[PDB]
Amino acid sequence: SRPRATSGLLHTSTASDKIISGDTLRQKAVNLGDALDGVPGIHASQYGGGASAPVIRGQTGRRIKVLNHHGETGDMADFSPDHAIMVDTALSQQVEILRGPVTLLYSSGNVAGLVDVADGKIPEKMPENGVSGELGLRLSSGNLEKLTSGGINIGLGKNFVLHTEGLYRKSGDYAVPRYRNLKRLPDSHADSQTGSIGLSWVGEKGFIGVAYSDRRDQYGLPAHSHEYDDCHADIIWQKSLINKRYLQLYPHLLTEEDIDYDNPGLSCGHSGRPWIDLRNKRYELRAEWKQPFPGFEALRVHLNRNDYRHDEKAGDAVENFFNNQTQNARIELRHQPIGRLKGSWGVQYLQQKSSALSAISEAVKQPMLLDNKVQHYSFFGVEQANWDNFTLEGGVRVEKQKASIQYDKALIDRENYYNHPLPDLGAHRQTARSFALSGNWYFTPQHKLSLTASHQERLPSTQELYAHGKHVATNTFEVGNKHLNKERSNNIELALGYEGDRWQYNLALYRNRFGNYIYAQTLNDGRGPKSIEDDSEMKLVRYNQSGADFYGAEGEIYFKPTPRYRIGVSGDYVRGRLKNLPSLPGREDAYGNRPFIAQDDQNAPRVPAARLGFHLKASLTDRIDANLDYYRVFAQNKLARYETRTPGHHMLNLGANYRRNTRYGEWNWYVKADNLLNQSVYAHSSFLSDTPQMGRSFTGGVNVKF
Ligand SMILES: CCCCCCCCOCCOCCOCCOCCO
Ligand SMILES: CCCCCCCCOCCOCCOCCOCCO
Ligand SMILES: CCCCCCCCOCCOCCOCCOCCO
Ligand SMILES: CCCCCCCCOCCOCCOCCOCCO
Ligand SMILES: CCCCCCCCOCCOCCOCCOCCO
Ligand SMILES: [Zn+2]
């Protein structure tokens, strides 16, 4: 048969949808952003060997959506690229990269791509021969990676299946070229282990089943100076701190009139290796039967509880505690067709209790994110109408968000007394309404043309609302904005796809217009003495809002002169611009007049550089499958406020695989050679733009299906 996406109960399908095989992924880098890097329109936001996030059409974090088998990952990778994404592509069956109204099934504000990682955790069928699974192993030079992985499915009778799976990865600091005196990049080592046990029913009509997962990651933080260890931010008026007084314990309640616009900044005045120790424990239940009750063709439910935490450490000492407890429930049903129009409607409840707190030195109370509770009540659905060779699908999502914070009312009344009226203290409630509409014309099949559009509202996160702390790994001190508005977006894309024996291609053109776009506004610049002297110095930011305009293009094209050979060209390009920046109050004059200074439109931070790809593939024969990949990464000269130019490199990759069969199972050998040119690889779209990536690496690996 053929690859079919699972993310939607109702199968929608644009021509830019892309399904990556798990078989392909067993030979790919472990972290999601690395694994996906190289797919047209996808770059990486790497942060050492420990983490990389996908950057899709210039977007990342809360403007895309990573899914662990239809479920919330529960991690804190939206917070900073510092933090690894809790999915395992090396243990995956499939990674589906989807565009269109399907995104509305899972979130509001996803404008670039839904990335769903599907797993074997809960079997869904029964294994041939009663047992099935695979075993995997690979080594990588200058990495120095050792990766072992395995999984098993066993029938406990006629309609019961147990699944186990696990992976361990060990890697040291990666080698780097010409980053002198240094053979390897310090603090870039990364170790990870995962395990899962599942147990499920069998159908028809479908399945019910549960699974438990457990993951430990331990990895260094590269380029981590301690110089800001003994530093705090002054951002609120001293006077305001003396009078409001609640801003000493709860500084997230500040308003614009509390910000010191004269001389805000850092006042300065744990000798161990920087690293992150992260633990994620997961309990879930999946279910899907094929004729629930009359009028509906399918029913799919999903329950999840996820315990996430991570310590940011120096030696054996913890500097920062990160915590995120997640519970998520979703019910989707697909109605029986009414009249060549089909539909899936669903409801979702999502609760996230999170904090990001410093170790109690204390050094004064400035919580990056105080303990907060966010609840998402979401109603959503998609409907597709079919006029034969033309499909038209619409999507909607209405989610109400309640952000609550547990105050000590208690101390606040007493500490404040009089004279001052206390702020709202109420729960922050907002409601997003989003719609999508998409048209697919299969004219002259197999020839697909999609036109997709959406108007989406993204609810501000508690990080964006209530941050008031220092996060060294991103070189920023984050201040939230308690009354942000919803990010509004108007999104348009046209995709064209062809596959015809000799030629294959996929082309896409997109534009994303915001819409009260939320962005980090640097304040500690061009003001008092605490303002920055250098571009590299730490930024004191407060979240603000403006217009934004992203547009770009991406594509691939392959030609097969012979069933043996395939030649290809790939490419992508993306522009991101901040428009309509708000005017900010400047220095107070000698007459006491503080003027609003206007800031021009400027470039978006860490937008990927253009990239061209050249590709060769050839089976020779039946078993051996050689391949060559030459990427031309161009320099990035469209720079945001404090960014520097990024080169600009030549990525040459060689590969080969040996397919060989026997009793029980299949033997997939592979040999890979990365960065043969040993070039200085820099990713403008990462927080470490000027730190080189892996110099040059040899990989040998085996996978054994059975
Ligand atoms: C199922 C466990 C068996 C795994 C052993 C793999 C065989 C070789 O691996 C040795 C692992 O450790 C070796 C130490 O170095 C790791 C990477 O090697 C670089 C040394 O040149
Ligand atoms: C068949 C080869 C598989 C070898 C990979 C090792 C898999 C072992 O890991 C699974 C067990 O891991 C449980 C989760 O990790 C432990 C985290 O908590 C304890 C601290 O390590
Ligand atoms: C629409 C892609 C296939 C092209 C064949 C023409 C389809 C005939 O109907 C055109 C209406 O299609 C609606 C497409 O969805 C709206 C996209 O733009 C929304 C902007 O408001
Ligand atoms: C709601 C289903 C139909 C989706 C189309 C809604 C409108 C989205 O427009 C798509 C085209 O994008 C640009 C539209 O421009 C009009 C307003 O744009 C400026 C917004 O800042
Ligand atoms: C199928 C291949 C056709 C390309 C599809 C669109 C991909 C875009 O590729 C264009 C890459 O162009 C290189 C851009 O050059 C550097 C960018 O900076 C120039 C601005 O001064
Ligand atoms: Zn962090």
Author numbering: 18 to 286, 298 to 734
Share the article's original sentences.
To elucidate the metal transportation mechanism, we attempted to capture ‘snapshots' of ZnuD in multiple translocation binding-states through co-crystallization and by soaking ZnuD with zinc or cadmium ions. The transition metal cadmium, which mimics and competes with zinc-binding sites in proteins, was a critical tool to stabilize and identify two additional binding sites. Indeed, all three ZnuD intermediate structures presented in this study contain a zinc ion buried in a high-affinity zinc-binding pocket. The metal ion captured within the high-affinity binding site is coordinated by four conserved residues (Asp-99, His-100, Glu-340 and His-499) located in a buried pocket that is sealed by the plug-apical loop and extracellular loop 6. The presence of zinc modulates the dynamic flexibility of the external loops by remodelling an α-helical segment into a pair of β-strand motifs. In addition, on binding its zinc ions on peripheral sites, the immunogenic loop 3 undergoes major conformational changes resulting in a switch between rigid (β-strand pairs) and flexible (α-helix) conformations. Our three structures illustrate that ZnuD undergoes drastic surface variations upon substrate binding to peripheral zinc-binding sites.
The zinc-uptake protein ZnuD is expressed under zinc-limiting conditions and was originally discovered in Neisseria meningitidis, where its expression is under the control of a zinc-sensing transcriptional factor, Zur14. ZnuD is an 82 kDa outer-membrane protein predicted to be a member of the TonB-dependent receptor (TbdR) family, requiring the mechanical energy derived from the TonB/ExbB/ExbD inner-membrane complex to couple nutrient uptake to the proton gradient across the inner-membrane. Characteristic of other TbdR family members, ZnuD consists of an amino-terminal plug domain (residues 1 to 147) obstructing the lumen of its own carboxy-terminal pore-forming domain (residues 148 to 734). Combined with molecular dynamic (MD) simulations, our structural findings suggest that ZnuD acquires free zinc ions using a series of binding sites that move zinc across the outer-membrane through a transient pore that requires TonB activation.
